Design a protein around this ligand. Sequence first.
Ligand SMILES: Nc1ncnc2c1ncn2[C@@H]1O[C@H](COP(=O)(O)OP(=O)(O)O)[C@@H](O)[C@H]1O
Ligand SMILES: Nc1ncnc2c1ncn2[C@@H]1O[C@H](COP(=O)(O)OP(=O)(O)O)[C@@H](O)[C@H]1O
Ligand SMILES: CC(C)C[C@H](Cl)C(=O)O
Ligand SMILES: CC(C)C[C@H](Cl)C(=O)O
Ligand SMILES: [K+]
Ligand SMILES: [K+]
Ligand SMILES: [Mg+2]
Ligand SMILES: [Mg+2]
Lengths: 310, 310
Amino acid sequence: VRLTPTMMLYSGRSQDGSHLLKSGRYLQQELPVRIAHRIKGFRSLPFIIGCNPTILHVHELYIRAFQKLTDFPPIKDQADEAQYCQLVRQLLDDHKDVVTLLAEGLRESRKHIEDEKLVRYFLDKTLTSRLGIRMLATHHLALHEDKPDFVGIICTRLSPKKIIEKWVDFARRLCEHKYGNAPRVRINGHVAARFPFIPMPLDYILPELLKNAMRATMESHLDTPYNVPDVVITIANNDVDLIIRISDRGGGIAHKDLDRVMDYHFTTAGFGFGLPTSRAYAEYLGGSLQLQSLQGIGTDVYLRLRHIDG
Amino acid sequence: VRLTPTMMLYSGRSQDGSHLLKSGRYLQQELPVRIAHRIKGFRSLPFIIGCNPTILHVHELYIRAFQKLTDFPPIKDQADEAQYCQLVRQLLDDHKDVVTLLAEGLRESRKHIEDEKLVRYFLDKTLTSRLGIRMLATHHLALHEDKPDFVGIICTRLSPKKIIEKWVDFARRLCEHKYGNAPRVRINGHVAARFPFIPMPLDYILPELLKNAMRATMESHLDTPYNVPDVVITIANNDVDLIIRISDRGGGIAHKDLDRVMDYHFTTAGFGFGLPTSRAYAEYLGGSLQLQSLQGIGTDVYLRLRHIDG
Ligand SMILES: Nc1ncnc2c1ncn2[C@@H]1O[C@H](COP(=O)(O)OP(=O)(O)O)[C@@H](O)[C@H]1O
Ligand SMILES: Nc1ncnc2c1ncn2[C@@H]1O[C@H](COP(=O)(O)OP(=O)(O)O)[C@@H](O)[C@H]1O
Ligand SMILES: CC(C)C[C@H](Cl)C(=O)O
Ligand SMILES: CC(C)C[C@H](Cl)C(=O)O
Ligand SMILES: [K+]
Ligand SMILES: [K+]
Ligand SMILES: [Mg+2]
Ligand SMILES: [Mg+2]
């Protein structure tokens, strides 16, 4: 029953399966209201942006979802609950490319307005609400599964080192595929820590930060691709939060780019969403994402995520 | 002729010694106005604080200095200039303990007022103005000296690694004297950098940050004083600024203390002035001082100082 902001992840264990029903009914009351807020967000977008065909498509997707959700009959039994899950699974899949569609839709249209704070706010609000909604929805679905060491999407004994290693292997492959090599990653600090935690946000954030650090490292070592400085990751685990520091020797973020890197769409090269999205996600969950640039040397990125209150 | 804020450090080279006169005359016009501002600062202190006998003593010192400075006759020749230097040297020495007197005077008296922003502002403004004044004054005196690789107090080829090493040896001695041992310090990054720079601010700041990192390291390793994690210092030198990162494995700054550590007087133990003073000095010179705490692991402190414009 651990909560994200104004949102609650049910921990329940009833052999009869009545927690599924209480969970299902909660989801059913909650999803339409939150989808309505997203729709209100689209309605208030500057006209010229809202008229972009890709933005209109996403706008329609949300209306469609609101329609199907409200059309679904109140849940009275396992049979209803079971069918609601099919709808939720369908919606989750239908909406899996939303971040990318928004990025495309907004890329050009955003420069047609005078106030630039506007799109930042819309995206921060839309993407984090969406993260919140997908977490709740996926958590409900997960309550059906019998994975050990999970209560829904909540890992009961998450190892930060393990999940970091997972995304390191992933980022290294992408990097090897593009450059013929990848920095090695060293992990230090509280490497043996284990605690209850929701992987989902880490699954978004970590690969974004690792891809950044690896790209920077390779692009600054073009003469010695076979011998590049390691990326060093430090884990700090205390009673308040989990801190993951990702340090590279990739030459740093230039002074002229520093005020831009947190802007959606800004890139010196994906589509420039990695940093602002990651920060918005971390702040939404009560944490933060901070950068320290050592121009000429490299960058330290500090991810902080609050622990699950007990 | 490199400048600090609203203040100018004369680079001059006249064999006849006329730059000494132009410098002297500049100092003579500039010191009284700036001392007057400091006096105005004392006049506007909350009554109950201004009545503290130590605060009153410092207040009087500044009046006395204004008196002697204004009483000094306009400078028309080397003889006048030469005598002005004696006065400046006397004043510099008379005022050498001002930071410490202010700290004592304010320690108790400050809690007697409702607005806490007040003392922070007074101290930030008083201490940085004082740094500015001492730099100009000392720079003038230094123009008389014939040290090679100096133009006044400006080192023409400052090595960050060398000046860091100087203060490392110093901090290690203090630390060894108190704990029987001291962390080793490793220095990496742009270790061979050399550039024109004014040592004075580094001479204040570095020992403060080194003492902090060493204390934290020892106090968190009481069982293994003979084997403690190194302090690691990274130098980054680029065209805009010099960055010095000081990282320790001293266990970090606790969440409950984090909002306090930049307050004058706050200490978990000198007199709690190291951090706020160092930050005020760095910002005054166009740089910054930022902390990243990894609670349970350690702390990274980032000092940034702008280069001398050319
Ligand atoms: N670790 C890093 N080192 C150097 N530059 C970085 C680092 N992380 C981000 N940046 C800079 O910030 C920009 C924004 O990154 P991001 O938001 O992830 O979008 P993208 O990776 O698509 O460019 C990058 O294009 C890059 O110039
Ligand atoms: N590197 C560090 N590691 C852990 N704690 C630190 C560090 N630097 C500063 N602190 C904390 O911040 C407080 C304020 O430090 P400072 O302003 O230098 O005053 P003082 O050193 O006199 O306490 C210290 O008492 C200490 O608790
Ligand atoms: C209707 C929901 C499940 C869709 C979420 Cl808000 C998303 O865009 O992925
Ligand atoms: C009169 C000057 C030289 C004194 C400076 Cl402002 C200081 O307090 O040290
Ligand atoms: K970006
Ligand atoms: K302090
Ligand atoms: Mg990226
Ligand atoms: Mg100190």
